[PDB]
Amino acid sequence: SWRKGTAFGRYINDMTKSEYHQEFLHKHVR
Amino acid sequence: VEFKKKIYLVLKSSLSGDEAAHKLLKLKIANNLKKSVVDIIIKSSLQESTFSKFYSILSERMITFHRSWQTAYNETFEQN
Amino acid sequence: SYNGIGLKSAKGSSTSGHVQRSLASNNRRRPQGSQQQRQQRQNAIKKASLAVQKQIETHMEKREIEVQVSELRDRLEEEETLSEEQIDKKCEALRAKLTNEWQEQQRM
Amino acid sequence: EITPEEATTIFSVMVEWLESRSFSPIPFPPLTYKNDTKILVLALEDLKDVYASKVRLNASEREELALIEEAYDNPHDTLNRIKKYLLTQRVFKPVDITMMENYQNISPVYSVDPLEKITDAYLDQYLWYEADQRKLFPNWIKPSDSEIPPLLVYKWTQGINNLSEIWDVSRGQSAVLLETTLGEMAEKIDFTLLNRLLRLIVDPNIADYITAKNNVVINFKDMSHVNKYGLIRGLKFASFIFQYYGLVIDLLLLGQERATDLAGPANNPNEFMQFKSKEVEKAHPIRLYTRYLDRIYMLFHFEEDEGEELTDEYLAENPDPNFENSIGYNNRKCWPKDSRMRLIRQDVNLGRAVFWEIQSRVPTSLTSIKWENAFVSVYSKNNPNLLFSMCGFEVRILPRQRMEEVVSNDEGVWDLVDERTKQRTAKAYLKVSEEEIKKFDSRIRGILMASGSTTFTKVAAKWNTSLISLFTYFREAIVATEPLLDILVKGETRIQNRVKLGLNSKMPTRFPPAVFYTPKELGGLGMISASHILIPASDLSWSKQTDTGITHFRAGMTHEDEKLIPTIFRYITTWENEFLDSQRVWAEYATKRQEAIQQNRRL
Amino acid sequence: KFLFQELVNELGLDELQLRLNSSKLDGMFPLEGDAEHIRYSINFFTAIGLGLL
RNA sequence: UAAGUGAUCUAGAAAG
């Protein structure tokens, strides 16, 4: 009942595009 | 006078009350001045803006330690 | 380090790395003995407070009879009763006399 | 990233919200105001705050100062200019940036060109005055409340305690506290959507301006780009925008109804975490909520049935044969094993399930609510402690009824009080968060470096500042954290070696604590010891499992001829004392104000 | 008054009463009337939130 | 049936 009332009720060889890299940047900027 | 100062310093130099208590116990103070020590502690407590858990914990520790200190705390209470 | 309790080592720490035992440790060593009256009071506050028994009784009773039987066996096997009839007869006697007595018990 | 349907939904939500509030929008500011001048004076003051300390100034800085001065000279004219700019100017000077180096995480520093900066300031101030006046931001939003972060934390704790029968574990009552960070909350705000959203709350011109300001060219060191998508934190007003966007997220989380309850009725709104009734408070699972600055704090108080439902839906949705999901769980690693959240198959499942539900609730295109950046604590039959971080604390709340033996409440513990009975119903042990410790350490490092040129007095002054910040911010909570103690000793000794290194001495006998801790009046340095403390060093292998009573004291910052230098921690009123005290004195003030009224006098 | 307040805040009201009941408490809680003397103690304890007076 | 034994890093020269 309570869960209804929401708005939404139910590898790459680029060091600048690595999942590790973006994640790292996210970590170390704020 | 200087004894009092020493006691005060011991209190201050601790972080939490437990440390202070430990330091005071290390002092090896005889049964004579235990009451005096307690009085000093109380006065120090008074000097502050508000009641601190610190002092309470210290009091607890000392009390626990030896019957003499329990007596001292009691008699201090009486004096108060 | 010492007893699972010293600093890993004095290098790093940027200090003596001297390791006193506290003297509040004696308080933490005996707080149950010091504050025994705290629990004591509590304990005092709550300090006032058939089938199996019957079964046990039954066992004792039947058991007693069986002891009689055993005794009969002893008397027979030891003192002149090589035959089986003697044993069986003895058992029968025990049953009759025993269960008679126990019938009396029941009646009472 | 936003699906247009999603955007539409968001719009519908926000519209619904303001509809429910009768929230009259903020106008474009005319010449009408009695406050206008006052408002201006605030912004200028704020700006001046940057420049009062640093006497040597850059060219840009100089220009800014000049502008400020002129503004003081010509207030009305300045105001007029600002108004004109707001009406017209939708292309600005590009924003230079740099990175200030907190040695964990380098932080971007946006530097707006002074002329626009004044505009940003004034606009910001005006917006806040209007918003708060009009009751835009509901109580539940944390950072802006006019209450101190430790104070905020304390209030939160109080709220938690004062929930009606919250600590019961009898009738399968199960609490869950959900800390999570709205990842990149500002960093993926689309200007289109943002613009439209703002056009709800303020006069469209202002919205247009703000949207146009976020769209700047970000010069850094010879490389530029048009900031096409993503709010810039480093504008003056940007905070307001972020907060407003935060409201959206909050609404999405709570829905219209629960949010409405938390706010209260529009005419007579709730105080921070109060409720019009008990019934209303009890109606929903989501008993409390607060978004301190892109980090929501949803407190759920489930029943056994509800919990079962949640576990069911989740577990069915996301199955696992073994316990399994206990690994990859965001526990509080600072606390000890039997202190932090125990890993019960049930409770953990509930927690994870709850998190999943919350994630489902917010759309992914709007923000990243990744489990990895989310701590979920649980309170239950099998979990007696209840954990969280807030404003860089770590707080282990433990109710008195669940404690085996209530010892002499230690230091660095907040005894929380139940509002009805006025008894100390629950304790809240306090550590300092690892993150905050790291930040502190970074600060120390910063101080240390760029000090070959710097003189001893200046160094010590900086260090003093750092230390006083660290304490006066979280005072009481230093007692607990041994790592912080270590840092303090280590850091302090490093500072001392900066002096001692400076004299190429670096030696114990010839720097007795006279030279350091004696004040600047007497040829000393004024260094403030948080050092000569005895560091409580309990059995490291046991301590990891359970909290010990402190048994063995290590010698922290030692010296030959040991004169017992007093710490700083003893001379700062620990927060709990400060807050009880505050309550007393403010009560007294209130009473005397009434007396004054009755007597008809100036108090 | 302050002391009592502290106690109540710590222990609890009913609990406190129980505790004191266990103890003697001559000056605080006299039972033998002493001619409008309990009035005084009673009065003072009405100043703070206390029962049983 | 009611105290205090004990763990104590450094450490100064050159050139920059």
Structural resolution in Å: 3.8
Using CB atoms within 10 Å of the CB of residue B29, give its burial: 0 to 12 exposed, 13 to 18 middle, 19+ buried. Answer: middle
Nearest-angstrom CA–CA distance, C33 and C17 = 33
Closest residue (CA to C1') to nucleotide F6 in the complex: C20
Nearest-angstrom CA–CA distance, D14 and D9 = 9
Nearest-angstrom CA–CA distance, D7 and D3 = 6
CA–centroid distance for A14 within its chain: 19
Contacts 24+ apart (CB under 8 A), D209-216: D209/D86, D209/D89, D209/D90, D209/D123, D210/D123, D210/D237, D210/D241, D212/D89, D212/D90, D212/D91, D212/D92, D213/D92, D213/D116, D213/D120, D213/D237, D214/D189, D214/D238, D214/D241, D215/D191, D216/D92, D216/D94, D216/D95
CB contact under 8 A, C22 and D486: no
Instruction: Measure the CA angle with vertex D267, ends D263 and D272; round to 5°.
Output: 30
Residue A19: list chain D partners with CB under 8 A: none
DSSP per-residue codes, D183-217: BTTTTT--HHHHHHHHHHHB-HHHHHHHHHHHS-B
Q: Which residue has the tokens 């049964």?
A: B31
Q: How far apart are the first and last CA of chain C?
A: 79
Q: Smallest Cα–Cα separation from D44: which of D89, D75, D87? A: D75
Q: If you measure CA to CA, which chain A residue comes closest to D363?
A: A8
Closest residue (CA to C1') to nucleotide F8 in the complex: C18
Q: Which residue has the tokens 């304490």?
A: D471
The SS3 of residue D97 is: strand
* Residues C72 and C91 sit within 8 Å (Cβ to Cβ): yes
Amino acid at D209: Y
Q: How far is the CA of D558 from the C1' of F9 (A)?
A: 10
Q: Which residues of D341-370 are buried (b: 16+ CB within 10 A; e: fewer)?
A: bbbbebbbbbbbbbbbbbbbbbbeebbbbe
* Residue partners of D264: CB distance under 8 A and separation at least 6: D270, D274, D275, D276
Nucleotide nearest to C14 (CA to C1'): F9
CB contact under 8 A, E9 and D424: yes
Neighbours of chain B (3+ CB pairs under 8 A): C, D
Which strands, in side-by-side order, build the sheet including D174-181? D286-288, D295-302, D174-181, D374-379
Closest residue (CA to C1') to nucleotide F11 in the complex: D507
* Residue D541 contacts C where some CB pair is shorter than 8 Å: yes
Nearest-angstrom CA–CA distance, B27 and B41 = 14
Contacts 24+ apart (CB under 8 A), D483-486: D483/D434, D483/D437, D484/D432, D484/D437, D484/D440, D485/B15, D485/D533, D485/D535, D485/D536, D485/D556, D486/C13, D486/D535
* Residues B16 and D481 sit within 8 Å (Cβ to Cβ): no
To the nearest 10°, report the CA torsion of D548, D552, D557, D561. 160
CB contact under 8 A, D534 and B14: yes
- CA D120, D124, D126, D131 torsion-angle sign: positive
Residue B56: list chain D partners with CB under 8 A: 408-409
Q: Which residue has the tokens 């009305």?
A: D76
Give strand pairing partners of D413: D429
* Residue D408 contacts B where some CB pair is shorter than 8 Å: yes
Nearest-angstrom CA–CA distance, C83 and D446 = 108
CB contact under 8 A, A29 and D108: yes
* Residues D396 and D387 sit within 8 Å (Cβ to Cβ): yes
CB proximity D552–strand F (7 Å threshold): yes
Amino acid at D99: M
Q: What is the 3-state secondary structure (H, E, C) of E2-51?
A: HHHHHHHHHCCHHHHHHHHHHCCCCCCCCCCCCCCCHHHHHHHHHHCCCC
Q: How far is CA D267 from CA B51, C4, D270, E17, in A?
A: 41, 62, 10, 44
**Integer Rg of chain E from CA:** 11
**Touching B: D residues 4-43, CB under 8 Å:** none
Give strand pairing partners of D109: D98
D149-162 vs D575-599: helix crossing angle, rounded to 10: 90
Nearest-angstrom CA–CA distance, D74 and D90 = 24
* Residues D283 and D328 sit within 8 Å (Cβ to Cβ): no
Nearest-angstrom CA–CA distance, D182 and D291 = 9
Contacts 24+ apart (CB under 8 A), D451-458: D451/D498, D456/D498, D456/D499, D456/D502, D456/D525, D457/D520, D457/D525, D457/D526
CB proximity B66–strand F (7 Å threshold): yes
Q: How far is the CA of B75 from the C1' of F2 (A)?
A: 20
Q: Encoding tokens for residue D154? A: 């304390």
DSSP per-residue codes, D154-187: HHHHHHHHHSTT-S--TTS-EEEEEEEE-BTTTT
* Residues D557 and B37 sit within 8 Å (Cβ to Cβ): no
Please state whether at least 3 CB pairs lie below 8 Å between chains E and A: no
Q: How far away is chain E from the Cα of D598, in angstroms, using its nearest Cα?
A: 22
* Residue C20 contacts D where some CB pair is shorter than 8 Å: yes
* Residue D406 contacts B where some CB pair is shorter than 8 Å: no
The SS3 of residue D399 is: strand
Residue B19: list chain C partners with CB under 8 A: 22
Helix (H) or strand (E) holding C21: strand C19-21
Q: How far away is chain D from the Cα of A19, in angstroms, using its nearest Cα?
A: 15
* Residue C13 contacts D where some CB pair is shorter than 8 Å: yes
Closest residue (CA to C1') to nucleotide F12 in the complex: D505
> In this structure, are strands D96-100 and D286-288 parallel, antiparallel, or unpaired?
unpaired
Which strands, in side-by-side order, build the sheet including D426-432? D386-390, D393-399, D426-432, D413-416
Experimental method: cryo-EM
CB contact under 8 A, D422 and E11: no
**Integer Rg of chain C from CA:** 36
Q: How many CB atoms lie within 10 A of CB E42?
A: 14
Nucleotide nearest to D509 (CA to C1'): F11
Nearest-angstrom CA–CA distance, D255 and A2 = 9
Q: Smallest Cα–Cα separation from D261: which of D270, D248, D253, D249? A: D270
The SS3 of residue D478 is: helix
Q: Smallest Cα–Cα separation from D388: which of D454, D350, D332? A: D332
Up-side HSE of residue D431: CA atoms within 13 Å toward CB? 22
CA–centroid distance for D424 within its chain: 26
Amino acid at D115: L
Domain carrying residue C65 = 1-108
* Residue C4 contacts D where some CB pair is shorter than 8 Å: yes
Instruction: Measure the CA angle with vertex D494, ends C15 and D534; round to 5°.
Output: 35
A29 → closest Cβ in D106, D256, D361? D106
Nearest-angstrom CA–CA distance, D476 and B17 = 12
Nucleotide nearest to D507 (CA to C1'): F11
CB contact under 8 A, E13 and D423: yes
Nearest-angstrom CA–CA distance, D299 and D282 = 12
Amino acid at D203: D
Q: Which residue has the tokens 């801790």?
A: D517
CB contact under 8 A, C22 and D550: yes
Nearest-angstrom CA–CA distance, D331 and C55 = 55
Helix (H) or strand (E) holding D428: strand D426-432
Nearest-angstrom CA–CA distance, D396 and D332 = 10
Using CB atoms within 10 Å of the CB of residue D450, give its burial: 0 to 12 exposed, 13 to 18 middle, 19+ buried. Answer: exposed
* Residue D422 contacts E where some CB pair is shorter than 8 Å: yes
Q: Smallest Cα–Cα separation from B7: which of B65, B77, B62? A: B62
Q: How far away is chain D from the Cα of B76, in angstroms, using its nearest Cα?
A: 20
DSSP per-residue codes, D234-297: TSSTHHHHHHHHHHHHHHHHHHHHHHHHHH--SSS---TT--S-HHHHHHSSEEE--BSSSEEE
CB contact under 8 A, D421 and E10: no
The SS3 of residue D136 is: coil
CB proximity C2–strand F (7 Å threshold): yes
DSSP D325: T
**Integer Rg of chain B from CA:** 11
The SS3 of residue D554 is: strand
CB proximity C18–strand F (7 Å threshold): yes
D553 → closest Cβ in C4, C20, C31? C20
Domain count within chain C: 1
Using CB atoms within 10 Å of the CB of residue D75, give its burial: 0 to 12 exposed, 13 to 18 middle, 19+ buried. Answer: middle
CB contact under 8 A, D10 and A7: yes
CB contact under 8 A, E8 and D417: no
DSSP C22: P
* Residue E8 contacts D where some CB pair is shorter than 8 Å: yes
Please state whether at least 3 CB pairs lie below 8 Å between chains A and D: yes
* Residue partners of D460: CB distance under 8 A and separation at least 6: D495, D499, D516, D525, D526, D527
Q: How many CB atoms lie within 10 A of CB D384?
A: 18
Q: How far away is chain B from the Cα of C38, in angstroms, using its nearest Cα?
A: 14
CA–centroid distance for D7 within its chain: 28
* Bases along strand F below 7 A from a protein CB: 1-14, 16
* Residues C4 and D548 sit within 8 Å (Cβ to Cβ): no
Q: How far apart are the first and last CA of chain E?
A: 15
Q: How many CB atoms lie within 10 A of CB D77?
A: 11
CB proximity C14–strand F (7 Å threshold): yes
To the nearest 10°, report the CA torsion of C57, C63, C68, C70. -170
Region for D98 from its dihedrals, namely left if φ exceeds 0, alpha if ψ lies in -120 to 50, beta otherwise: beta
Nearest-angstrom CA–CA distance, E4 and D274 = 29
Return the residue in D467, D479, D528, D547 with the most chain B beta carbons within 10 A, the one to mutate for interface testing: D479
* Residue B16 contacts D where some CB pair is shorter than 8 Å: yes
CB contact under 8 A, A30 and D105: yes
* Residue partners of D422: CB distance under 8 A and separation at least 6: E8, E9, E49
Nearest-angstrom CA–CA distance, D271 and D275 = 8
* Residues C18 and D493 sit within 8 Å (Cβ to Cβ): no
